[model samples]
Target chain A: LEYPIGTPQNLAGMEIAAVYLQPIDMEPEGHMRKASESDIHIEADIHALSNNPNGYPEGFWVPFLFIKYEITKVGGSGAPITGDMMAMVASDGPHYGDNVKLQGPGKYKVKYTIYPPNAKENPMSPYYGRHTDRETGVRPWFKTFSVEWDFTYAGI
Target chain B: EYPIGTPQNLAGMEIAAVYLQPIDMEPEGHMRKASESDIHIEADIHALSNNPNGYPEGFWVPFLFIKYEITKVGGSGAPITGDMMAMVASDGPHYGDNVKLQGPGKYKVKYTIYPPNAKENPMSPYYGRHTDRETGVRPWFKTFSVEWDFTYAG
Candidate 1:
């Protein structure tokens, strides 16, 4: 009746919120604009599964959960997407997120890199219970997951 | 008695503080591990005392920039010349001119210097504007033009 998320035993032991992924506004819009300025705005919900492995609730920050994202294009000439911002789930979960404007028409892929705080500076993972050697506490992995979106645009 | 394309205030400038550093490497004469991948070429530049009589000025070329390219010493690392100022990069807005290397190799980097108010490129602020004219005051003189080769190890 209780288990950690993304686990066997099909348990959400750290229960109450068996939250899952539920993205809003997953569609394509022409977003007609000049080739010079075609910046777009997004008011996201950033939901977490609310039920066991399928639960979705409208909050991003909780105990130790956070999200980081990056956007890039496959071709068609554009600037390199760099750095991280927004999406650190907390008590008063921020319901909105924003992205710097993308300036070209290509197969732009958004990559999300999830990680525990200070995971890079240290080899120990905050969520190592999933490791087969849980008792030894030697999981040398980020132990994180992420999702991405495909956005395409050609400046008018 | 001015040259076809030379500024009158071409006196007090000098390419002082020109130096470079190689990233992700051990001290010289040591066998390096085969797995270290991050290697690149980076350089910093500066000009000082470009006055009429070897004296320092208060204001000179509000902006300084360069044109450069890298070629593999024995091969072809990264080489581009007679290119634009922006494409190569300057220490302006930032303090370093850097580029990634093609791995463990000997490389040659060539760079050209530009003085204040020289109309080399219409897109650059150094176009048709002298150092003194830009700042309203006089301490800023001007610099001469030059080129150099830099080496790299990875």
Candidate 2:
């Protein structure tokens, strides 16, 4: 993998899931653009490559989460490239496996963090990583991830 | 205001799985355990960012840091006390800032700040229950800060 990863922890913590991104010319594509355009839309999908770790604390937590990401910045630059590039709010079931766009790139950075939501719809996600009642202020704040990849995308 | 469905933006969160274990819960979805020791946290407070200290070189992204502790409990009327070694060394206590997963929660680390603390106490207070997630940016130089523990940096 051309992905520059940190020490062992990055690998251990990583391989969280598989992130496959397709260009703006896919079926049912919403946001569409070229790599040199303002927003190069791509279909992103994430899923487990393997099972969870085999042990205690590490094992338990590892499988419990894959990753929730956002596209923070785009290299080529366009409109300051808002939104973390990946997906922060996962309203679309267990992984933010939906239609995500890449904001024009030379180096597209996808910030993946520790994502363990109480998904109510996913039998595979944590107990209930969903709907902790957002309308009320009784929601939660989450963090603690050490990884980032600033790289270019070479397509066919 | 943090977005709905999304967790609050917690930068330097401390999951004190060390202070108390979760097989139990209080009414407000809090922990109700009575144990304390070396204060081993299962959470990641070490966020990687452009480091002043020298780290690996030659990569698309190469950030570094290396680095724990807690304070207080309950609340004003009925709070508890504990001793967590608050040593904010600009390094890491997190095992490479891996993803820490526990079902319940911790008092929100809140988020990152410009000063780490402020007029009241740059450090946010502790909580019996907290909801957490993760982020890719660790803008600070340290993790493992102690707040509300009624102690000093010493």
Candidate 3:
């Protein structure tokens, strides 16, 4: 049986510095009931660069990056999960720790959202938000991407 | 003259008479020969008011009169002697009376004038030299109390 490997190029823009795709052993009734025998779970260690550090203040604000996941194929008679995209930001933990949390698991091809800075509005000009950039529009802090595991799970 | 009546009846008769005093009110002073002269004298009467004779608030009369007398004459020609009265109300203050000659030398003039309100403690407006509103003219009036003296066309 040939198993495909997950390459960095496959998840290029994703923050996945390293990934561990492992197959868990299961009973035949569970394996046979399902045509494909590969039961894969991904353990990924996302990088903590300055752009998207692991932790921030209590009400720290950050811009959303993309989160995409697509079930490229299904080995047996199972409903194929579709691709999805979402925007998420880290909530808590150290500046370089595993505090990353998922924002949305919606069935969408792509999604985008913005997390504005936690600041007070300028009293003089109530029309404007806390921060603004007259030149290059508004600034977004972080961005990320995600993909499904089955894309590499072949020849089950 | 009337025929004499009884001495006792004269006390009850009404008498009307007139007394006259010949007094020269003309101006007089040292005179100078006319060289070349352009002397001019200007005067104006400011205001006037009058009360008719009687006790119980009799007729009240008011009059504004302005008179300019050649108080002094100067310049080269014959002494420019003249007097004009400019009625203060309708006519503005630029009038002078007749000019009377006083020899060929520049002669000083003196005048005796009276305005209606001359008796007021603070002489009423009718009694002095004043300026006119419409035209920037000035005329003088009332008693020779004030005099402008100088040499003029004799």
Q: What DockQ do the predictions score, one after another?
A: 0.01, 0.02, 0.00
Preferred candidate (DockQ higher): 2 or 3: 2
lDDT of 3 by residue, B52-132 (tens): 111011111112222333432444444344333321111111212223444444344433344424552122321111111
Q: Write the per-residue lDDT of candidate 1 for residues A15-121, one digit (tens) a residue.
A: 22222121112111121122123254222233232431211122212122333556677753556664343321111223223324554455666654444323552
Q: Would you give me the overall lDDT of model 2?
A: 0.27
- Ranked by lDDT from best down, the candidates are 1, 2, 3
Taking chain B only, the TM-score of every model is 0.43, 0.22, 0.29
Instruction: Arrange candidates, best DockQ first.
Output: 2, 1, 3
Error of 2 at B54 (Å): 44
lDDT of 2 at A95: 24
Model 1, native contacts kept? 0.00
lDDT of 2 by residue, B1-154 (tens): 1111222222323222222121211112222121322222222332223322111121111111222222223323322222121211111121111112222223332222222212322122110000012111222234433232221111
Docking class of 2: incorrect
Candidate 2 lDDT, A1-156, residue by residue in tens: 112322222343234433433422211123223323433332123222232222112222222333345555554434433322222112122122333454434556655555433333223231211112223112231334535555465542
